[PDB]
Structures are given as structure tokens and as C-alpha cells.
Symmetry: D2
């Protein structure tokens, strides 16, 4: 039952591009990639080669193919303890999934700051550009379960655990700069509204159902994050190509005691990029694991995800200087008003070994701060601080979750807490209380100070009566949605209109659709009319006369809110499909692969069957996948080299591959006689921006394709796609 | 600094006698003691000295005396994460206790065999007299909760976890050679009957209630173990002075494949010794922790508990050679018929560091066997095999209970089981199933063989129909109870009669007492008449004429069943109370302590207050406890030195001390004017056997006292005690 | 039939003095004692007489004395689901005990006010002397486990669940009017110091050990409740003969919104009485269930615990 | 025991039998049924041994396994007839 003699079962322990080798556990694929946290898990990593198979109690098993029975056709005996241990462990493998963000994908890596930030914060991990902090990052969707799809329309989470020398700091962010609601008391209302409805548990991974739009129509505070979700922000191309945000105003506290308000940002060094809806939705069925898989392959290839941490900083005395409340998590701080200051770089460079042990059991929580940071009274953050510790008592089985290896600090931890289920740490301290004399009071409290100090909260003044009351300053709901809308490009605006139109078409009760369109009329009449037209709804004269909300502190727009208005393309780590034929022109393939290699763009070689085909010069080309097996949804562009085009000219899947890529606005390059495919997608002889064509694949041809890919999609083509039947 | 300047907060890290130092965690009290399992726990041991106090996330705490509030008289704020972590851990400290044997006390040690037993078993731990196997042993009662008292009347558990090189072997025994029931299906019935009754949850730690005796009266198979429980076996002096038994016939399997039937024994090398009932009951009140304390203090003093493992061996072809069924766990195998062959020695030499983490969380289970051992069809064992794995899923939170440090094998363990709550091990195997090619099928099965082989069950022949039926061969209930009774000394017999009588006096429904007396008449008429008399019950003519059960294989007694018929006393580790006065005769005290030291007998110096007193010759004597604080229940003998006897002669507590000790049959020694105390216990001028007396405390005075201590109690005193009001 | 001919297995369903009859479950001992809460529990009470023994899935058992085996001296078979269900349930009977107050004893009753308190509180259960509110009360020690002894020296808990028409109100009190510490953040320090010490888990049900007195000596805020615990308050004769206190200033709020500060008291109508130390300690060995027993038997005899 | 939290999962409403169920099992997490039986074991006299075993029979009888003959040695072996 064994391994093939050629060793082809085992992936090379070197960087390889996606598809070239089977994927593997990180410590086996990249054994020389280390950081302090990765090394500290060595106590619990378990190998396998050359070891005997045993029970969990260390007894070697002779026959792992049979139960013990009385005769070989007889009944199974209760004394078969080997069977019972094996099936007992299997019978209790599952733990509760996260209430929200159950679907997520994670990796190890490291962070360092560009310069010391000691003038603004005493946090140790931001104090020295050469002090490296390990991280573990989990990206996620929000609504769907652990087995739902990746490329749904949803908000994405972006949670980073920093293993700093002064404790764990978790920055528990999302990919939009605000949230749907203002006060954590309503969290279960909102989450229950977006989750599968309680009678039938439908729909999975989708806000396109009556209870979510009912809630939105009745809670206009949600409209800002709804605008982001209905935009292409809701359907990122990759976790490597979305922004991250900390969602709330926190504080930085320096050694002198000064508090500065801060909002956190992650900038993707691979640039901002998203899918289009039809593509995203069909990809949930063709590969529901697309983002998990693309993240893990990028790291195996060396395309390590990189992000730049950034801070918006607002002095304490400027708290009230905007036309929105800084503590309102439904409001963003426009970068035209407060720029993002670059802080440092995070690189994710190793996958886990065991998903369950490291990803499923990781626990992140925004109350895990360190000295040099603090909270504010944002009323959504305030409630979060309760939830993330509470929930782990069921999800991870008790209050020792910090002993599960991925969650352990690399900083020392010592205190008087004891016991609890599956307690690992064996305390030798004679004392389990303080103050004590019997252990001379150790471990001891530490005064606060400039470095290595105890935690003390900033002494914020509190003046007010005990009230359950929303601040009047939070009672504005339309200006930030309008600012977002006005900052999008015209194609982005169309995709927003199309997301609300598609979602509200799935709401069964028409009055809910009508009430949402009435909200949209309070944001922008052009948006509201365009959604209304798609729903067969006519705005009333009163709706037509609603006065638009005010500008936000004088801004008519802010281009940093758009995915695309300011070019930020990076093709490295992108992937092209190359459609083969049974006699490829090897000179074309050489030129294509050389130019892709030079820019770090990968290729997948596709055909109408698996196995190999041979080029004109005898080169044997292994086939990665069939046309149907790896659809155009999974790539950024498509190239069709010359050769025996007749082999694939009438293949329906090859033609459709080009029709789908064209509809989804992807660059297409056709060399030599592959130009015959121009007829399936109706390109005029003169050509069209977005379709690269030449007699051969050469310097010029590849440069044009790569320039297209740096612009991500061919937006100019949008008016041409309505008519394609694909 | 809160520790005192003279360092008297820290116990000496060397062997010290009971009461000389405060007790400490084992790795601090005896840092030099080691074994392979203690060494392997070092990775989870946590210190404390010189460390900062932190959260579990590694954040240093500045103020561990206050919650965070809005103003110093204000409300506590939800953002106080340090408070909520600390209280959340506290709030979840408790795990379910064990369904039975919840009260227990444990220590680390080691085992070695006297010679290789390879001719009868291939078990690795028994293959080489040089192979030392670490153990962890927990002793226990059965009925009461973890917070119940130690010196109750009950059966005692004796469970040994052997960390062998071929897996964990747990020997999960009790202190009697049989059990109350025959088939595991009745275990919940019997246990529910003995446990606190379900309306009101009374009584704790006692079988002296209606439902236990109802069950017994209706299930005569229980009478054998009930006889043991009603004897002084039910109230051992120490876990060091009781026997252990494995309860069932198991099998040894040698390398040739030969099966030999085996029952396991532990012989206490400190000898056999039990309390008397009034003393055991009163001690549950004066020190409900007395056995846990005596075990821990013995190990700290170097009086290490030692036991000799022994085997009764029966060839396969002798299965049916006895009057009873070897598979019937209500039958013993008399040592007169099958001698115990000595196998090896176990020494317990280190206390745990943290009771909850190593004691409460340890999981023992008799299915945990290794190659070279196997089961039989004993139908109580057979059902035990199901229970001990099952119960851990609630008690220890899931199927990873073998990853809790104390339960981890020291042998290698590798297999394809994954996940579960609390998963510590991070598996790097590319495969989680077999057969697999992608990891060359590792970890691999191992064929059985003479050493280091896989487990294979002995190929016992099974023949019969699928039945829920008791073997007719188990249907004899009275002969073994009668053999036990006839093997007891006359004073052991009196104490059996007094245990049934006291217990049945607590049964509220008189017909249950009558039904139990009827059962006793089937065992022995003298026993039944003596119990009936104490209950005011008269036997019928039919009861008087019940034929006694047959002898067991021609035996009418077996002296190995008695605690005391054959002297096996050992005084090392026993303790004497020395009653002081305000002017002790120093020469008496020097001779007493000199002789006690030479035999390794401890002493406690008692007085009417704490502090010190000064001897006649100026010597300062430090007081350990008051008369009331350390009652005679807690010692093995009492010595009163001469001196200013007037000081304590009219002290109620001092007189009562000697009356209590006298009643409980303990040796008492009086020197010089301490002979005045003879009047309080009604001793004649010519003296009596068991009371040592002389003008001074030497020549032969201490030899006489130590000879009385070697015989444990003064049984000839029994007729004199009913007159003393104590 | 295993019961005696003369019916003497079954206690009379009438009030009887301690020891006169075997004790019984309360709905069999006092079937006509009713309140809104006891009646609302009828949906889950299960009886037994004249019903067949079954699995939890409702299958009748023929032989509840044996496992299924291949031959009457054979191995037990894994297909014995009746055995496995019964032993599975037994194997999982225990739940974690309470972190503190694990040892306690409880009964049902009712509460009624002497007059309307509407001038000082709008709490519905205090609005009219006709308002009868069911209660369930649990008395407890603090330190010891659920199987520890009753007559230890300790503080006692006195917790009352009021089932009101406007919600559950729990008045969760003790038998002294103060506590050992000032701020909740030190609760785990104090409780760890009084509980059995962590190396060896001794002593059970006692403050008489080094870590408790080490904490007290270093935290003089504790001295007031330490005085109460060292007095005979710490060893009551009965849960019927000790005081209760709500420990804290709470507020009453009336219909007009006026707040009045309040501290709560329970006054035992059987009066105040305690043991002496030697008797209490010995009694933990002679009858560790003495207070649980005395409470149950008092209610069975009609000596109903009453508090104002 | 992990999925539904303990051994009282038959008391979760959808899983409850409509047939009567009565036995001596007690306690467990989430226990709903409040048993009034003075006995929680059998055989007992204090509740006249109820609830009682029921012999097998044509209708409303107790469960008894079919007395299939078993004959063989204790083996971990696949039957050749399965190969
Ligand atoms: C009051 C509003 C409120 C409340 C009560 C909660 N959430 Fe969360 N959220 C919880 C509660 C839970 C229940 O504790 C839970 C689920 C399981 C767990 O261990 O924690 C959790 C997960 C979570 C992750 C996954 C971390 C991971 O990969 O494991 C991320 C990225 C976010 N959240 C991000 C987030 C932001 C970005 C600003 C905002 C705003 C909010 N959320 C809102 C919020
Ligand atoms: C079918 C008959 C039957 C059944 C079903 C059981 N018992 Fe146990 N018994 C269990 C079931 C449980 C409930 O699984 C449990 C509860 C917690 C646990 O993990 O296992 C347990 C504990 C236990 C200990 C404590 C080990 C320790 O110190 O942690 C000891 C020494 C013994 N037993 C000894 C023992 C003997 C000596 C031969 C005989 C016979 C029996 N018992 C009878 C028996
Ligand atoms: C910060 C100060 C503090 C903190 C944190 C706690 N305690 Fe408690 N206490 C808890 C914590 C827990 C852990 O929640 C726990 C444990 C299990 C549970 O569910 O609640 C509990 C039980 C408890 C009972 C038994 C109720 C019953 O029969 O179940 C009674 C009568 C009292 N207490 C009385 C009490 C008073 C009267 C003034 C004062 C003051 C305090 N205590 C102080 C206190
Ligand atoms: S947020
Ligand atoms: S046994
Ligand atoms: S209190």
C-alpha cells in the first residue's frame, strides 16, 4: 500500500507555483521558515514517519483493519478497546463553530514597524524598527458556517494576533471601515436578521433575504455598511487584495501619558481588487474554497501576503471637530480629512500544519490589548469587550483556552488563576492568592511606566447619568452613505445599483423592497431611481423632493473610498489560463511563459482532457486541468497560443471559457490562428481595448497583456457584455 | 517584602517528620527526586518567584486590588478586561467529580520487578529486573464526594498507572478481593443504592441507610463484599496499611502464546492495620482529611509507602478445578489453594505539585492494558471496559484526555485520530487515514511478537447463544462469606457483628433489618444470632435450622483473610502523642524520643496551650498542638512523662485524651507520677497488659511500649472498655 | 411482590415527627401542599408505580439483571444497547459543583407581605398583602464541596428565588451582614486563600489553615467578617435559627422614580441559636448531614422554617 | 454526549418518545424529568419494585435478543466470504 517508487507522492520543500506540487503542512513545505511563535509550537508538533501506529495510551496496534469478534462472521465484542477508543475520538471530533466569522482561513507571519513610534505610544511592538513580532492572521466571511463558500457577498474579517514581548495584542478588524450598527446591544438582532432565517435555516452565506432587508429598512444606521457590502468591496478577489480596518477609534498612550485617538488600517501591498457578482456567485459553486486555496498557494509560491499597518491619528483636543462623532462606528474618518500615517509591514509567510488545531481553535478578541494602547467609549467596541472572552467558554470548552497552543503568549504569563477544564499548566507556586507571604508575594504587580510596566487605564473623565440612551450626535445616517456613493467610479456605482437590485429582487415581501428604496432616496436620487427601475418601482413626488444630506466636512468625494479610481495594480501572484491545443506553437509558449515569469504571474495549462500533449518541437506539456475543471472564474486573464487551433476551435467548453472571461471583464490574448476565436466574443477586425491579438506571442503582445492585467479588469467593455449569452 | 525576615515562611527542601515544617508542592519539597514521568512533566510546570503578575495573555497587571470604575466610588466598567478574565477563570474552575471514587489522594513513584517474568508474560515492564517503570497511584473511598471524609466505612480504591515503554497499563484495584455484584449491568443499581438517597441526598460517605440494605437483602450475591466492608477492612488506618487486589481474573500471555489466568495483589510492606469504628467515625469529624494528610506527610518524611505486587496464577487447564467459578468477581481465590507469587516492589516517593492538575484530572481505566496481558469473560470486568473510557468525555471535557499532562504516556503514541475539544497535538502527517500512500502508510501497524509487538487478543474459544443470562455456576452466595467469617479472629468477628448491628440500626424500615438477619442465618448462625440480639430480633426455629453452606474446596478457614491472625506489624511511620506538663522531667523525654527515633516512630508534643514549656533542667520544649487540637484519634499510642503532673491532673482534656486512647485499644505508657492517671482509666495497682508503667522512662519501658505498638492495638482490652464513659 | 405485606415500606402522607416514618420526596409526603411554582412543575414530574421499566427511548426491558453475552459465561456483546444506555447515563451523572456554596440544602415555600409597599417600591410582589409569591430557598456553607459536612465553622449562604409575576427576583444573602472583602476583583484571592490549599487539597470545610490567616493578616478589611465567623455565628444550630442579610445597599424605586437605599434582612421566627465548637466539630463526624436532615425533617413534621 | 451536551438528549423535545418511559436512571446535565420514585435502583422493596421488568411476549412485551448461536475464537479477522 505504498508510496510510488519515484517519490512523486511528496511535495518538494521549496517554493513552487500553484498546481505544481500537492499542497502540504507548512512545517513540511517550508521547514526553514521560522519565527519565535512557530518555534514555540515545536513541543506539540507530532510527526509520523517511521513510527508505529498506537492507541492514544501508547499501545501498538497489530490489526487496524478489523474489529474483535467471536468468529470471523460473529458479533463485535465489548472488550475491543482499540475500536472503541478510535471510534470515541472520531465521535467527538467537532467543537462549536464561531457564532460569526465561522468561515475563515489563516496563516503565520511577522510584523515590524518602519520607525519607533515612542512619541505617540509606549507599546513595545511599535518601539524599534528591528524588533520583529510574530503574527497569526485569520481572514473570514461573517454570516456563513465553517463549511460555507468563500466568494459570497459579505463583509470580510481580518484578525491579527501579535505575539508581543509585553503580551498578546489582537487587532480584530474587517475589510470596511465601519459597521452596520451603533450599539452592541443590537448585535444579536442584526446578526439574527442577516443569518439563515430561523424556521428553515435559509439562506447560507447571503444577505439576500427578507429578514436582513427588513432590519435595514427599519434601522437607517445600517445604510453606510450596506453601501459597502453592495459594492464590489463585498466580493474581494483575494484576501491579499482587500483593505483592512480596525472599525473603532482606540487610543494610543505614550510614556508621558498623552492619549491620541487612533483608527487602524491595513493597506494591501498587492493592491485593491474585487470580483464581479456573476463571477463571485458562480465561483461559490465551482470552487467554494477559492480564497482559502488562493491564500495557501500564494504562501507556498512565495507570493507572501503583505500589508502595511497605518494609523489615522486625531489629537484629544480635536475629538469634536468633525461633523460626525468620532465614537460612532457607523461613521468613517475620510482620509482627505485625516491621512493614514504608515506604521509598518506585515508579511504572512507560512501556512499552518493542522487546520483544526491552529485555525479552528485560534481565539482572537479586541480586548486583548497591551500597555500603550487603550479603548474609547465607542458603544459597539464597549460591548465587544464582553463577548470575545465569554464565547470561548463553550466554543473552546473552558477558561484555559489560552493554553491551546496557537493561543499561547510567547511573553511570560504568571498569575494566581488555577484549575478549569483540561488545565495544562502545573503551578508549583505554594500560593494561589495575593497578597501572600508564603511565596514573598510572587508573582508581583508592576507599576506602570515607560516600558515593561503594568497596565493602567487612561484616566478619561466620565460625567453623565446612568442611561440607556443613544447619543444625539449619532442620529445622522445618510451623509456617509452619500460620500461613499459619490466617491465611486461610474462602473462601481453601476455595480452598487446592481447589488441592491439583485438582493431586493430576492426579498419576497414587496413592501420591504419599497421601504429600502425610500431609504435610498434619502442618500442619492440617482441611486434610488436606478434601483427602483430594476424593481419596477416608481418614486413618488415626495421621494423625488427629498433634500440630499450634507457633505461631510465640505467633501464632495474622497477617492480613497474607491477600489479603482486611483491605480494601485500589482500583477505578481496573479494567474493566467493558457488554453492548449494538441500541437502548440512552442515559440509562442516560450515567449508567454518567459514574460509571465518576469512579472511573477503564474500559469495554468488547460486542455479538453488530462495527461499530456506534445508541442511542435516535441516538448511534452502536462495538463493542469480541463477547460471545465478549472473555469475562467479561477484566473485573471486568458491566453490562447497558436498551433493546431482546429483541435479546439469547435470545442464548446473552450469557446465558452472565452465567453465567460469576456463577460467578467478579463483580459484575453489570442496569437496567430487563435484569433479565429474573436468571432465567439464578437470582436471587430480592428480589435478592441482589452483583447490583445498578433500573429505571434512576443515582447509587444505580452507587454500589452500585462499592462491590461495591472489594471485588473477591462471596465470599458461593460456596455458590450449585456448582449453576450454567457 | 511580605515574607518574614528569618525565612520561616519556606519549608525545608529535605525530609522532615510530620508537623515539623509546613507541607509543600512535591517539586519544591523534594527537588532531587526524579523519574522518567516526573521529568516529562517539566514542560508544563510553572514557577512564580521573580515573575510579574500577568493576565493569561501575558499582559502585566499594575493594580490587582481594584476594579476599574468611573470615579473611586463609581460603577464598574465593562471595559475592565483584567477583572473579567480573572473572575471568568474563577467561575469555571470546577469539573465534574468522578461518578464513584470521587474522594482520593495520589502520589508519584516507581516500580521494578524482582526478576524477568518472560516465561509467563511478554509485558515489557515485567521483562528485566533493571527496568524501572514510573507510576502514579490514587487511593480513594467509593461512595462520598470529592469533599467527603477519609476515615469512613467503605471499600477503598487503589489505582496504579504504570507508564511503561509499551504503553500505559492501569491496574485499577480495591482493598478487598471481590466486588458486591456479578454483572456490570447492575452497577448503577448497586451504586445508586449505596449513594445518598435521591430525594434528600443523605447520607454522605455511609452505607448505613435503607436503600443500601434493601438492595443487599434482595441480592445475596452482595453478601461476600458486605462481610468485608462490615469488618475492620472497611476502616483502614492508612492507605499504607491496607491490601490491594485487582478484583478479577485477567490473563498473562507469554511470547509462545500461552495464556495463564492471573489475579493481582498488592501487599503493604508496612503491614495490615485498621482503625476501630468509634475512632474512625469520630475522626471523620476531627480531621476529615486524615488519610490524605497521612499519605502526603509520610512521603515528605521519607516513610515512603511500599507495596509488593503479587500474582495468583492458574493454568488454563485448571479453569474448572475449584468449587467456584474463576470468572465470578464475588468469589475469592483462597491463598491456601493458590499462593501469591511475589513479582516486584512499588515505592511512592513524591507528592504532586498541584492537586487539581495531577490528582483530580488523572484518568485510570482497567481496559488500559499492554501486550502480555489480556482480559477474561468475567462479566463485571467486561462492562467496566465500556465505562472508564466513556465517563471521561464529560469529566475531562472530551476525547483528548490522554493529552492532559498526568495522563500522557511516556511511550511514543502516533495515530490517525484528529481534533476534539482541547486538542494539543499538532499533527504534521499529510495523511489522517490508513492505508495511505501519501505518507508511505506511516504510522504503521506492527505484527505481534515477543517484544515491542502489536496487541493481538488471545484467541479464546467462544460458544453459545446470544443470552442475557447469569451462569448457573455463579449461583452460590454464602460459602465465601462463611469462609471469610471463620477466618477472622474472635475480636475481628465481634467488630463484624458490631458493624452490621450499627448499620442496620440506622435502617428506618424494620423489615429490611429482618431480611438482612435472614441472610446472615444462611452464612453462620452465631453471626446471625449476635446481630439479631443487638436489633431486638429473635430468630425463628426455621432460621435456627438452616444448614450452613459447604466449605470452599475443603477449607474451613484461610488465615490470610484476617487482618491480624498472623502478626505483620511495622512501627516505622507511626506516631505517638506525648502529653507535656509545665515542668517535664527531661531525662524521661530524652529516653522516650531516643527510642522512638531509633525505630522511626514520630512524636507530637501536646499541651493545654501553644508556645513552649521549659523542662526541669531548663530545656525549652516547643508545643505542637493542644490536647483538643490533636486528639488521640490521630495517634497510635500515648506516653505521659513524669514531672509536674499536678499541672495537668485536673485538666478535662488531658484525662479525656487517655480515656479516648484507652477505649480505642491504643498502647498507653505512664512514667513516674504520670501513673496518677491510672485512676482516670480504672487501671488496678498491679497494672494490666497494654498499659506500660515504671518509675522512669527507661531500661525496658520504651522496649515494652514499642512491642505493644508492633502489635498495633491491645485486643485483650476489649472486655474492659464498655465500662469507661468515653 | 417485594414490598412487605403490612405496607410499612411507605411513609404516611401526613405530617409526622422526626424519625417516626422514613423520609420521602415532597410531592409524595405532602401531595396537597401547593403553590403556583410547585403546580407549574407538574409537566416534568415523573411517577413510577404500575409503569414498565424501559430504556430512555421507551423500549420495555425484559431482563434488567444481565448483560447480553455469547453463552452464559461468554464475552459481553457490543450490540447490548440496553446495557450501554444505562451505563452511559450513569457515567455522565455528575455536573460541576458550585465554585463556592457547593454544599447546600433547599426547600419550597411562599412569601407574602404584611402591607402594600407602593409608597417606596413598585415591585409587584410587594404591592399588596394578598400577593402570594412562591419561593425556593437554598441554604449553604461556603468553602466545602457538595459532599462536605454541614456543621463546620463557616459563613452560611441563604439564597431565595422569588417567582414573581414580573420576573424572578433572587435575594442571594448570607448569615452575616457584611463580607470579608471590599472589591470583587479580589474574590478569587480570598476564596483561594480559604479553600483547600492547592498542593494537597487540604483542609475541607475549614478556615483553620495557613493561607486563610496569611490573607487575613495582610488584608485588615477582612477582620469584620472574620469576627463573625469566629463567633458562634459560624456554627448555627439549624438553618431555621440563623439570621439572613442581603450583604449590600440596593435601591427601592417607587412609581414616582424616587430611590431609597435599602439593606435586606431575614429574621428567624424560631429565634437565633448556635452550637458550641466542640459539639459542631464532633457532629461533622457523627452526622455530616445534620443540617440538611434537620431542615427536611422539620418541614416533614410541620415545623415549617419561617422568616420575616 | 458532546453534540447534545450529555446523556439526557432524549429529553430534548423532538427526541422524546410518545411511548411511556420510566427507569432508574437519574441526573446528568440538563436533567428535565423530576423523578418522584422513592427508589432509584432495582430490585427495591421501597417502591414495590416499580417500574418493573416485563417478560417478552406477542404484544407489549419486554425486549429479548434472538438467541443466535455464536461459535468461534476471539479474532480480528475479516470473513473470507467478504473478500
Ligand atoms: C458588538 C459588536 C460585536 C460582537 C458582540 C461580536 N462581534 Fe466580532 N465576534 C464576536 C462578537 C464573538 C461572538 O465574540 C466572536 C465569534 C467567535 C469568537 O471567537 O469571537 C467574534 C468574531 C469576530 C472575528 C473572528 C476572529 C476569528 O477569526 O476568530 C472578527 C474579525 C470579528 N469578530 C470582527 C468584528 C468587528 C471588526 C471591527 C466588529 C465591529 C465586530 N466583530 C462586531 C462584534
Ligand atoms: C462494572 C463494575 C464497575 C464499573 C462500571 C465501574 N467500576 Fe470502578 N469505576 C467506574 C465504573 C467508573 C464510573 O468509570 C469510574 C468513575 C470515574 C472513573 O474514571 O472510572 C470508576 C472509578 C474507579 C476507581 C478510581 C480511579 C481513580 O482513582 O481515579 C477505582 C480504583 C475503581 N473504579 C476500582 C474498581 C474495581 C476494582 C476491581 C471494580 C471491580 C470496580 N471499580 C467496579 C466498577
Ligand atoms: C464579588 C463578591 C462575590 C462574587 C464574585 C460571588 N459571591 Fe456569592 N457566589 C458567586 C460569586 C458565584 C461564583 O457566582 C456563585 C457560585 C455558584 C453560583 O452560581 O454563584 C456564588 C454563590 C453564592 C450563593 C449560593 C446560591 C445557591 O444556593 O446556589 C450564596 C448564598 C452566595 N453566593 C452569597 C453571597 C453574598 C451575600 C452577600 C455575597 C456578598 C457574595 N456571595 C459574594 C460574592
Ligand atoms: S467597526
Ligand atoms: S472486583
Ligand atoms: S455582602
Amino acid at each position: 500500500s505504498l508510496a510510488p517508487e519515484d517519490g512523486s507522492h511528496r511535495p518538494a520543500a521549496e517554493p513552487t507555483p500553484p498546481g505544481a506540487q500537492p499542497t502540504a503542512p507548512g512545517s513540511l513545505k517550508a521547514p526553514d521558515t521560522r519565527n519565535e511563535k512557530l518555534n514555540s509550537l515545536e513541543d506539540v508538533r507530532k510527526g509520523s514517519e517511521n513510527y508505529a501506529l498506537t492507541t492514544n495510551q501508547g499501545v501498538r496496534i497489530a490489526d487496524d483493519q478489523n474489529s474483535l469478534r467471536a468468529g470471523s462472521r460473529g458479533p463485535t465484542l465489548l472488550e475491543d478497546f482499540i475500536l472503541r477508543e478510535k471510534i470515541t475520538h472520531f465521535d467527538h471530533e467537532r467543537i462549536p463553530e464561531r457564532i460569526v466569522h465561522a468561515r475563515g482561513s489563516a496563516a503565520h507571519g511577522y510584523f515590524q514597524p518602519y520607525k519607533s513610534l515612542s512619541d505617540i505610544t509606549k507599546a513595545d511592538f511599535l518601539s524599534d524598527p528591528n524588533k520583529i513580532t510574530p503574527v497569526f492572521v485569520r481572514f473570514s466571511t461573517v454570516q456563513g458556517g465553517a463549511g460555507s463558500a468563500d466568494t459570497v457577498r459579505d463583509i470580510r474579517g481580518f484578525a491579527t494576533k501579535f505575539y508581543t514581548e509585553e503580551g498578546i495584542f489582537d487587532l480584530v478588524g474587517n475589510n470596511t471601515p465601519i459597521f452596520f450598527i451603533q450599539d452592541a446591544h443590537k448585535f444579536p438582532d442584526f446578526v439574527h436578521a442577516v443569518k439563515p432565517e430561523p424556521h428553515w435555516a435559509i439562506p447560507q452565506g447571503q444577505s439576500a433575504h427578507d429578514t436582513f432587508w427588513d432590519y435595514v429598512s427599519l434601522q437607517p444606521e445600517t445604510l453606510h455598511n450596506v453601501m459597502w457590502a453592495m459594492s464590489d468591496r463585498g466580493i474581494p478577489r483575494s484576501y491579499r487584495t482587500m483593505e483592512g480596518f480596525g472599525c473603532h477609534t482606540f487610543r494610543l498612550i505614550n510614556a508621558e501619558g498623552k492619549a491620541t485617538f487612533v483608527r487602524f488600517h491595513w493597506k494591501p501591498l498587492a493592491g485593491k481588487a474585487s470580483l464581479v457578482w456573476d463571477e463571485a456567485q458562480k465561483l461559490t459553486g465551482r470552487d467554494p474554497d477559492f480564497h482559502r486555496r488562493e491564500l495557501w498557494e500564494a504562501i507556498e509560491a512565495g507570493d507572501f501576503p503583505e500589508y502595511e499597518l497605518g494609523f489615522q491619528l486625531i489629537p484629544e483636543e480635536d475629538e469634536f471637530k468633525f461633523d460626525f462623532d468620532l465614537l460612532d462606528p457607523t461613521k468613517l474618518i475620510p482620509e482627505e480629512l485625516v491621512p493614514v500615517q504608515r506604521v509598518g509591514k506585515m508579511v504572512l509567510n507560512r501556512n499552518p500544519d493542522n487546520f483544526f488545531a491552529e485555525n479552528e481553535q485560534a481565539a482572537f478578541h479586541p480586548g486583548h490589548i497591551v500597555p500603550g494602547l487603550d479603548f474609547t467609549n465607542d458603544p459597539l467596541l464597549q460591548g465587544r469587550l464582553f463577548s470575545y472572552t465569554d464565547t470561548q467558554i463553550s466554543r473552546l470548552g473552558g477558561p484555559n483556552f489560552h493554553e491551546i497552543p496557537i493561543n499561547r503568549p510567547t511573553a511570560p504569563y504568571h498569575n494566581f488563576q488555577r484549575d478549569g477544564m483540561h488545565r495544562m499548566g502545573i503551578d508549583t507556586n505554594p500560593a494561589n492568592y495575593e497578597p501572600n507571604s508564603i511565596n514573598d508575594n510572587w508573582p508581583r504587580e508592576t507599576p506602570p511606566g515607560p516600558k515593561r510596566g503594568g497596565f493602567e487605564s487612561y484616566q478619561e473623565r466620565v460625567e453623565g447619568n446612568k442611561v440607556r440612551e443613544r447619543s444625539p450626535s449619532f442620529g445622522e445616517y445618510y451623509s456617509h452613505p452619500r460620500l461613499f456613493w459619490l466617491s465611486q467610479t461610474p462602473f462601481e456605482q453601476r455595480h452598487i445599483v446592481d447589488g441592491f437590485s439583485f438582493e431586493l429582487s430576492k426579498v419576497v415581501r414587496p413592501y420591504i423592497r419599497e421601504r429600502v428604496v425610500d431609504q435610498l432616496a434619502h442618500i442619492d436620487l440617482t441611486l434610488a431611481q436606478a434601483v427602483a427601475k430594476n424593481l419596477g418601482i416608481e418614486l413618488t413626488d415626495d421621494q423625488l423632493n427629498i433634500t440630499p444630506p450634507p457633505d461631510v466636512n465640505g467633501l464632495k468625494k474622497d477617492p480613497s473610498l474607491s477600489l479603482y479610481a486611483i491605480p494601485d495594480g500589482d500583477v505578481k501572484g496573479r494567474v493566467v489560463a493558457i488554453l492548449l491545443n494538441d500541437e502548440v506553437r512552442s515559440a509562442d509558449l516560450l515567449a508567454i511563459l518567459k514574460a509571465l515569469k518576469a512579472k511573477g504571474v503564474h500559469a495554468k495549462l488547460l486542455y479538453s482532457r488530462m495527461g499530456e500533449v506534445t508541442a511542435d518541437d516535441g516538448t511534452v506539456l502536462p495538463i493542469a486541468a480541463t477547460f471545465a475543471g478549472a473555469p475562467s472564474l479561477t484566473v485573471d486573464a486568458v491566453i490562447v497560443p497558436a498551433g493546431n487551433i482546429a483541435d479546439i476551435a469547435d470545442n464548446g467548453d473552450a469557446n465558452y471559457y472565452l465567453m465567460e472571461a469576456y463577460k467578467h471583464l478579463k483580459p484575453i490574448a489570442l496569437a496567430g490562428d487563435a484569433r479565429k476565436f474573436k468571432a465567439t466574443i464578437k470582436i471587430a477586425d480592428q480589435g478592441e481595448e482589452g483583447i490583445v491579438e498578433a500573429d505571434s506571442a512576443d515582447g509587444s503582445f505580452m507587454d500589452e497583456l500585462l499592462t491590461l492585467m495591472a489594471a485588473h479588469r477591462v471596465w470599458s467593455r461593460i456596455p458590450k457584455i449585456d448582449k453576450i449569452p454567457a
